[PDB]
Amino acid sequence: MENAHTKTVEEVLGHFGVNESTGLSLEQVKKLKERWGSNELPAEEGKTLLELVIEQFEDLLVRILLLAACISFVLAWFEEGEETITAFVEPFVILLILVANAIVGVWQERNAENAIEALKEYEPEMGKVYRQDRKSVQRIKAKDIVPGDIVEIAVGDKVPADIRLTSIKSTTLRVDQSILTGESVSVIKHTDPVPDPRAVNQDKKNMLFSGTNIAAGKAMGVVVATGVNTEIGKIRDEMVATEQERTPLQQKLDEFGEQLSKVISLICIAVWIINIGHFNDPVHGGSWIRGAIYYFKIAVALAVAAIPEGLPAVITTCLALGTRRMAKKNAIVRSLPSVETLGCTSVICSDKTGTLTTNQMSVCRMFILDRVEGDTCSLNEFTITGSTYAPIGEVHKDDKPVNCHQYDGLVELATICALCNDSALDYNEAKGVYEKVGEATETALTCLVEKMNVFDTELKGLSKIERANACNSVIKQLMKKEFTLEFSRDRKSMSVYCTPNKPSRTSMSKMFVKGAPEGVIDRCTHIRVGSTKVPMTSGVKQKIMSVIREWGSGSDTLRCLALATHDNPLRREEMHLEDSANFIKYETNLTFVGCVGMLDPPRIEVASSVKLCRQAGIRVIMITGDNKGTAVAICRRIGIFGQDEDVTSKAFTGREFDELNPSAQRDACLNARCFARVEPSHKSKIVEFLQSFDEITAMTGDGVNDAPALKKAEIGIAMGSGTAVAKTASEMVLADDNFSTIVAAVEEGRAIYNNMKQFIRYLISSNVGEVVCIFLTAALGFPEALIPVQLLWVNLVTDGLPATALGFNPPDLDIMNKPPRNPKEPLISGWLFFRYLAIGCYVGAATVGAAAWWFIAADGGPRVSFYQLSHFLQCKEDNPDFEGVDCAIFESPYPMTMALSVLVTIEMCNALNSLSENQSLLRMPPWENIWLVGSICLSMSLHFLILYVEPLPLIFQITPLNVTQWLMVLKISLPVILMDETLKFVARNYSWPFVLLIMPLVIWVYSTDTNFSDMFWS
């Protein structure tokens, strides 16, 4: 059945072959069941850990590292029995870091909440259905309802499937459609067809939708769609068809990984070509026997040197620290990688009710009659302060405190509001927040009554439990409700009959009236001025109507609720209380006591957040299921739209949006800033159109309708008092219900992204330095200087501690005044690429020289020959007298610890001057980041431990160093800071206590004058 709302009830009955009270037969129900299925939303299967691990192992960098570990294990098998189990430490440690990365990634991306199964609890467990031929009413589970079936729904019942209403009992059907519109207001429904092929769910008032409870009233209806074909079915389908896409930083890192893999392949091929020169098959030797292990030892070392192993760990640590800061700001973050993507947000999409507003209806304006002029009257307008159901508020007439006891019209209005309401107010001691037991409008009237002590009741020390209803109880003690007249569609008003409790009261019959201004005023024939009744006149009616229209159609489109009372009601026994037609007849001689106006009020922290978003370059677009007028009024109130701003081509509705031209279809999302009366699919389409412009969108909401948009958007935020569907479909939850936390999170994400760029560049520079070192050692043929396990230790511990310290950098001063960054921004620029490539080349050359320094120019150590004996695998016993030295000195740990110490100290110095992108270290000292110096001294302490503890110098081929060699290492390492400062100065042009600290040290280390002898190849 398509467009069931357009067709009449007879047509939709005939199409299904269904009649009232004889809905279906035992075979027709089976045919409809097999044709469609079951009234159920298929759940999402939980993601198993095995598939998560397999997918996370698909990373190219991880794959290269795993291949390196495997080939290292193969090489270690060929190793002799002379060495101990330390030969297998390398594959073990590489596998350990790989599984550590996998486990930390699982911890990062594991969420127990499921987007469908736990969330779709809106489906009723049981519903009275199946008006088949067997009996009358069948209370069978809603799991197996067929589209042809007839359903009856009662008060508090949840609609099982998409139902096209046929008959309405109790004259009113109040439906709560918050899951599809976000509004808790009761939607009065009818059975008349709406003759439009394309209509939003709000326009469809002849249909019932699954998962929506009934505020009041009972009715009968015929199902139209079930299971996936329902509106909640569309919500679930949107919830499952959206797969989270890698954040822009992750895309940049994947591009870097692909580039790194290709350059690894090229460098490995080049090394293999060069290794042919040293080990040539025409030259008689064991080229295959022993040249293979040397080449593959390079390949494993090259792969280890290229991959920044500690980068995922430090990134996770930084994201976890940012998440902890957010949790200290009362905002719990569910996904760490989405913390940084907050900074690059181009557009913020928001839901009006609950997120921008308080979702607590409160009356803000009210007026009564004080003086009546000739064809004119004087309205005593008041304003109510308060946006919460708590009765803490004051009346303001021209912004002055007012005591309502003196005014008699206010007392009458308060009595009418107290008695003519069915709802009430209660206090939750557990939560500490007053909540509405019934309708929002009647609860707002109750709160207004309690705010002003019209009888001057004493509330000096009343408990919060009894403060909720004290004034209402005092009023109700005076007047008792004999009966009530229910709301009706035709009269659009509510009447309550009351009798005074005092036995000697002269007046004994009063009917209070509360309803829509039009009908109530047209049915009003007198005006209540103070305690005196006044005949009505045309001018007073016209001015009252004009005031109502300006209150309900301007900057603050409040819902208008006219009030009245009946001073001469007919006797109770004279009444015929069966039909609603007699109600309007009995409601004809009212006196206009006054009127009130109410709206959903925005929070007291939204407008500032919106203007701060505008300052930072983020556009805040409001998308809501409410009517366009209220949406625009709230937009103007919170500052999205100007008070006098024209919104002809900037505010749209879903029906307007769908029919719009494709070029204008793009243009609307390009320029418009407010969307109202939109389905959840419309919100998803808005977000998708915004993303099509390559813009990161932040969706904020608190309802089920927001969930498809929250999932579709890159980052989704949910309020801490909204539905669990929004909470679990969003990456961030605002526990304190504070909107400024969003701009705070954007600021923290920008700072986090800056720090992440800094330490990513630092780690990549270290890695390229190690790669250049390995390539130089392979090409020259010199004995190895850096072993892969030393590279693991350097890349993980002594780099992650400085990397975390660099992630602890203070943020930029102008961080929140800058526009959002382009998502396609390269992580490395050309000049910075040149800087870090030069640093890496210097690191490689320095490590190679430090290894060669011990071999050739050893001060106090064994001095080998020139670069002629650079090749060392050709050394053998009974050699042609190359030198009278042992051939086993080439494996000594002294050159290896030389290279390790040079690398570590150069990395420490690089961490010192990686504090800033282009600011020199002289301008801002390392003392600014007190974590940086602490992490660096901790890393030096760790290095000294691995040098001087008992077992550790065995795993790493290193030995303790004497003072002279340590000074040589320092002399080699120091010029890196000078080189970085020079490069920074060139970048810039194309404090004193810190400066005086290093002067006594630089002279002391450089005082010794030690020269070299390697000059022939130069």
Ligand code: ALF
């Ligand atoms: F609360 Al809404 F669209 F206004 F989900």
Ligand SMILES: [Mg+2]
């Ligand atoms: Mg909402």
